[PDB]
Amino acid sequence: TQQPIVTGTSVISMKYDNGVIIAADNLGSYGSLLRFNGVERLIPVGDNTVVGISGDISDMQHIERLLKDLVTENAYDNPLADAEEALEPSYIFEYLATVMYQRRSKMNPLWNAIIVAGVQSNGDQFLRYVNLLGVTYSSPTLATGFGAHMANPLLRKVVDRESDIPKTTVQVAEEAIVNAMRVLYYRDARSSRNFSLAIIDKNTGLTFKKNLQVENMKWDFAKDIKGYGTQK
Amino acid sequence: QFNPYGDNGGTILGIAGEDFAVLAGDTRNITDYSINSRYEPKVFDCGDNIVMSANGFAADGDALVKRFKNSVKWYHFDHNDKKLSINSAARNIQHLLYGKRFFPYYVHTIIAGLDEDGKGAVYSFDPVGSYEREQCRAGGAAASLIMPFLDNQVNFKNQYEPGTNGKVKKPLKYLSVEEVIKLVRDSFTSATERHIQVGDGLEILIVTKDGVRKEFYELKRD
Amino acid sequence: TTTLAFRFQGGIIVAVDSRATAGNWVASQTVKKVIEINPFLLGTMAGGAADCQFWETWLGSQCRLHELREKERISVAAASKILSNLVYQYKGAGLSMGTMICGYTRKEGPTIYYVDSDGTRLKGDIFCVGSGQTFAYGVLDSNYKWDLSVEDALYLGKRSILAAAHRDAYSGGSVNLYHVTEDGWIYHGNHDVGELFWKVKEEEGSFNNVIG
Amino acid sequence: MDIILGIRVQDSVILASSKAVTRGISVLKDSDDKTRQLSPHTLMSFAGEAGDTVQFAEYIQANIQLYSIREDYELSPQAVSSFVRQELAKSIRSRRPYQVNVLIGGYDKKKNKPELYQIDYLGTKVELPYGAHGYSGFYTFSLLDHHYRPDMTTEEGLDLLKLCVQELEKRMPMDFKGVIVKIVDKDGIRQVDDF
Amino acid sequence: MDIILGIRVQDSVILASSKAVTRGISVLKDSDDKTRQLSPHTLMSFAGEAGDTVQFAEYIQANIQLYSIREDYELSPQAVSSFVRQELAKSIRSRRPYQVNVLIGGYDKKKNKPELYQIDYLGTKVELPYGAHGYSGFYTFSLLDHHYRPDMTTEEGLDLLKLCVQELEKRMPMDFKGVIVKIVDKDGIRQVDDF
Amino acid sequence: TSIMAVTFKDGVILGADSRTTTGAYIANRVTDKLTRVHDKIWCCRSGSAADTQAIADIVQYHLELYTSQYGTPSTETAASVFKELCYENKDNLTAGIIVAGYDDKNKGEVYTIPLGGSVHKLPYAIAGSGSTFIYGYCDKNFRENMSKEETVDFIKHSLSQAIKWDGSSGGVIRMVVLTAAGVERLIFYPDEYEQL
Amino acid sequence: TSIMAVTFKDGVILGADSRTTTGAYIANRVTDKLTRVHDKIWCCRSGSAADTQAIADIVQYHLELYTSQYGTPSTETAASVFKELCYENKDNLTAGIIVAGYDDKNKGEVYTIPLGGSVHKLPYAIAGSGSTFIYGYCDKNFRENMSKEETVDFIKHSLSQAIKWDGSSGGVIRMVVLTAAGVERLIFYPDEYEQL
Amino acid sequence: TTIVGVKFNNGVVIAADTRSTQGPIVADKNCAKLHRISPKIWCAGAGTAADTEAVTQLIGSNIELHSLYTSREPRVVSALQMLKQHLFKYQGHIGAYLIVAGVDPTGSHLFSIHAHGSTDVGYYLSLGSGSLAAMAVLESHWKQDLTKEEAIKLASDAIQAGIWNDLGSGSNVDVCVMEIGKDAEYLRNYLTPNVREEKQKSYKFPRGTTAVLKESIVNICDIQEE
Amino acid sequence: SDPSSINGGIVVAMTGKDCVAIACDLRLGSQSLGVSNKFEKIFHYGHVFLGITGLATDVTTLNEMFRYKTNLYKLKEERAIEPETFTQLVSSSLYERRFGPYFVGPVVAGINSKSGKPFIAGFDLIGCIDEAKDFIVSGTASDQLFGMCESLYEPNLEPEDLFETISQALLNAADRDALSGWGAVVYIIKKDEVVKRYLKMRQD
Ligand SMILES: *[C@@H]1CC(=O)NCC[C@H](O)C[C@H](NC(=O)[C@@H](NC(=O)CCCCc2ccccc2)[C@@H](C)O)C(=O)N[C@H]1C
Ligand SMILES: *[C@@H]1CC(=O)NCC[C@H](O)C[C@H](NC(=O)[C@@H](NC(=O)CCCCc2ccccc2)[C@@H](C)O)C(=O)N[C@H]1C
Ligand SMILES: [Mg+2]
């Protein structure tokens, strides 16, 4: 049993026709102090998987090292390490899900919520969630923390059920994700303007975008607002 | 303080027919007032014509189902591919559950299948492994909404024959698979209306001598 | 939960209700509160249902191993003590059990041991355990004799559960009867309390407080 | 206080009430009468927290006696029980509630019927053929459920009451030092001096 | 368990022990013997937490019986009490202590003297002319202080014990369902079947 | 919350962020924390929004009634009325208020009233959760008798840092300028102050 | 406590106050919070003095044994050893450590290890109770590739403010300079830094 | 509960879902959460449902009397001030979270008010368990100079977000439009996207199925003549 | 400890074609101990019916209070109170005890004498009105009653059919609750006749 100290906020994600998109801001908060402004919380594993992590950053960095070691280990005595016997998103997830549930069962959890986004060998989209309790679930859109409350409602308007996935292009999906990140910046006190976004496509592979910013912000209407009731 | 348990909502329902059994469950997974998934399968085919669902805390539910599936695999290895009978599966699950007596699997477990005479069977477990063969059992969030309805419409409780006025009970005539599925669907439609954690979809697994079949039905998404 | 067992001329009567609850919610009305340890030994269920089921099933395995090794039926004293020694090892951990180990052997005759999860092991003639125990005791104590017939003893046990099922909110559903003889126990049916109440009211003239 | 029983038969109400007063470690008294006569044909037994019991009973007694003088008329048992219930129902939301449970046994001279009312400290009133407070009912109700008839004589009521007291003496852990029994009928209130 | 008394007279030790076993609400048994024979001339009565009492008593019994067989010799009451005290003194700093108080009454065949030892669950041993555990001493010691003499006969000891039991039955709130009395002397252990 | 008031040559300027949070949720991102109790006596509110609004409304009432009887009140008088409410109800209030005003006789004045209900007259004052991060900056950069443009820059830079580090602060930087010339409202948006 | 480490053109400089408090009593007014784990790898300690000393002693042992087998360790290696102890014993430790070191290949490097046991490589780092008051000041005034004299002034001014506002900080400002030239110790007394 | 307020060109619109709950159970599937303070001042309530009704009716009563006393149509700022001073008095124990909107001679207004007595001004607001879902929609689609038709669309879309994604909210969308120089139009069940499907079976019982002990006529009439 | 589930009991109300039905169990208990099998929870003031579940002392107190208030209403108004007006009176009366409430779950049922329209309503303990078209439930087996009513109910049932539906809803809900049962009563209410039926049910 611990308490999280340095923390990362929402990770948001969704499926589209040919793959998956995942995004997360670059902040490490220390309570209400916005302490660390350059933290990468999307961690790619090979060229087919991205693991997005929220919650405790020290536990994130531990998970980051486990994944790094998983790649090394998979390559040992494996002539097909870069081909048929490469790490799949489903392998990486199940491993993490095993670790998360084991750790909660010893009453010493990794204080995180994790989304594994990727594309399988056969071109299938993979998107699944796991948290400090070892609870797992999949959905056409997934989000952690504040994203669950604010991003999912917006992302579900694009992909409401399974049958909406083939109808959703990568341009529409990315647009929805970027708008969701702006909404979170307006409304989450522990978020930042700077974020990272990753696309895993079955055709074009892994595109990792760093140093993105929330833009096209509406603030002008603030000038007209005066007092809290009767003031002029 | 760290709380190792959670509540993922959901509701499940097992009904044993004369030569079949059904195990149904809604596909909604939740925490607090949020929806995690509108389609997260909760009832599983475990092999040997057995279906299982462990409803409550989804992490413990997944762990238990996983361990039972594994127990079926090792039963085949150790005993010359012998078919695991539903009564034997039930006893095995008791030992899985009671093995964690002082840190329970926070789940209400139901399995369904056919007994060794080919008749429909449902077994129901508490979180610590007390179990019992039953004709009818709802589990989870909306179990209190569904069970009274099943007492009335499956076992004909408080129903008597017209003209006799309480003297002769309504006779316990057997229900077909089509008739059971109607009661399952109406149970979940009703539960969806009055319980916030029930909705999205209903997945039914039907077990007969011919094997395991699936049926899916939409539920209200509010 | 209401369970009773009493020694008499013809052996032992065991009678239990069938209700199980989780707070106010009635979880089941079909619970089997008599555990058939083997063909000669019976155990009753009170407190946590899982603990009684699991450990009295386990007890049956220990009794079977005893008679394989010793080529002789286990004594009720020895069987009850296997269970009481076991639960005593777990004392403090939070097991919840109130049970009566009932049997009929050559050397002992009909014997009942109350075994309990804080370690208690008591031999006796009449025991009643559960939320409805006091109601069942009232009927038992005023009507019990050693020279009851098997028929009258069976009824007394049935009537004592009915008394508790009526008044105690957490007892009811149905009554399960057993008669333990030296050659083994004999099951004497499941009796729905709903139907039994009205039957008893009319035939006995009791429950004049209730309108029927 | 501990055990208070009540049984309404054909033509009378019988109240039985324990004699023991225990202050923690010792039994200070073994002859305590846990009852007050409210009017010539209405008796109230009581049990609950020390001090409050008697204070409440005497306060009720004074008020009913005041009514009797003012109107030159005895209130019906029903009317008295309703008055008592209201006082307890008022009490439960007070700064310091009366922690007192009562049985009111009365003979209504207008209707020529015995009446037994059971009222707990919350102001929960019920008219019954037989009643109790505390753990007394747990032991005795199964016997009363079996043996009770509405057409019982006073002597049959007393015999059924003996069986109840015997079961209490067998299975209750506390020694309540026996019971004082009182009968309420058309002729008024009298105490059974041998029980 | 509840009341356990002990009195050492001229030529014997008398142990009296209540017969009631109460599990919360009901009295489950009214004939319980709260004693074990450790050797032919040594008796141990006990009272404390449910389960622990009997488990401890039988464990001690087994060990003393083992010693008797190994050496073909009966340990003195003093030796047995010292063994018992050490077991309790070991127990008090365990993970889960035995919550058991005992009286050990024995007749030493070497010295031709009766001996009574009182040992509580902490391993506090005292040799006494008369002793008790729990609340029993509060009621009885004033009587024993007054009437006791070291040269009493066994019959006088039993009469003094009756007076102690009567005072307990008068002033104790709990009904302990009387006592089983046992005498330990040069001829061994015997039970007084009428008391 | 990040709030400050700064005296300068021509009078006084009040400054504030616009973020109101319920835990980590931003309940209002365009809050006006600069509130008017008289024509040229304003205040900055921090702590319980309910409490500081209730107080500010009562003060405005007292100064309106003061004005009807005795003419324009001093800034010191306004601060004293605030103090009286904060001090006498300290057990039931969570309010940290900065009072700033312009007289012609006294010119620009700033009074801070922290949690206890004490009053402190200062050349400038900072308060709210975000103020902790700018004690160093404000102490090094404040000068007396600054110009209007310098004071606006001092406040803008200060609150910019407070917003940058404090999660409870954010949104727009509002300001209110109090001089002989009158009452001027200013607003500065994220795209302006973040790049500073 | 007020501690900081700042990379600059020629390497890195660590800075600290000297106050150790037990509540409001100053148990030691001349504490040395800059501690050596290797020739040119030092650290700044904050949190439990017992814990940070115990950790620093173990690290020094590990790097001594590393040096005997594999030659001079990197600053990253030192930070990793610190992290391993802080992370794996997070339940029993209250330690906030800044690790600073000079390689010839990597030049000046700074790693901060806050309470959780996470590692963050930064151009400069501030920590301890007094750091809260200088986030604003340090962010506005830090530049990369400063000279030695500029970096000493940056640290001196920063910790001066931290000391001014934080009661838990005070005494002398100690500094340790890490360059190719070697290891230089500096000290600055109250009469010097208070008038800044 | 999901309640929203949206300002537009010539007025303000208010909206709410229709689900009231007791824990995880749904008490009322078609609850009315839009309260009339006065003819052209309406408000939406979240939190304790009794409190939102009680506090609106009390203020609405006092607003009516004030309007008669002053011979003037009531103002939103009056309702606002009276609500906040009342709620503040009870220190949050009256658990009413309201969005107060309306038109009066001064113009159109939109305010929120929390149980402790704090108030906020805005062009778009949301409240209740579904407020985050609603606010996500409002932040994505709100702009200055909305028309009436756009504001009703935006408001009801924000409620829908709450209906579908928040378990506390559900059933139907209620709307009330308050435009300047017009009667306020209360659109009860503006949307109905949650009609229950036909059941598989009729459960109408055969007459005489239930066992009966006694029957009697109940005398509801008064004491009769003659 | 929880005041609303010490005594136990349930009430359910339903609408039909030109009729309403209100029903209740007869149990009063002290937690596990059954005390009375004749504790009726439905009362009437003229043609308006009020069922009350919860703490039994408050059930009794509120009945006496509404009898008081409806009697004075009638003397002043010179007419019987209507279900819609009475509903507001219950709500008002409960909310005036907002911070020390009556631990009850009232249910109003009746037909408006002028319009002939069937009416039902429910309340929480502090007076929040739930005015459903179909049905209202209250008590310790309210979950069970919701489940029964939600599946069994259909609109526009004739009086004698509505009797069966509400009776089966109550009976089967009560049998799945430890603290409800011990008898039951069903009122069938039409514009100018009211029939009251006691039901035979299991007595455990
Ligand atoms: C007799 C009645 C009786 O004695 N009741 C006393 C309380 C008993 O415990 C009730 C028992 N009921 C059950 O055993 C019941 N199962 C459970 O209560 C499982 C509870 C799991 C709780 C839990 C704690 C922490 C984490 C996860 C779960 C039946 C349904 O299994 C009972 O009915 N006893 C009867 C025989
Ligand atoms: C909007 C949803 C919402 O905001 N939900 C959050 C929780 C709300 O409290 C639910 C609320 N439900 C009710 O109001 C429910 N009744 C109560 O909550 C009664 C509470 C009584 C508390 C109390 C008072 C005095 C003494 C002791 C306790 C109604 C529906 O029966 C709700 O639905 N909110 C909706 C409007
Ligand atoms: Mg739902």
Ligand SMILES: [Mg+2]
């Ligand atoms: Mg019962």
Ligand SMILES: [Mg+2]
């Ligand atoms: Mg910010």
Ligand SMILES: [Mg+2]
């Ligand atoms: Mg029942």
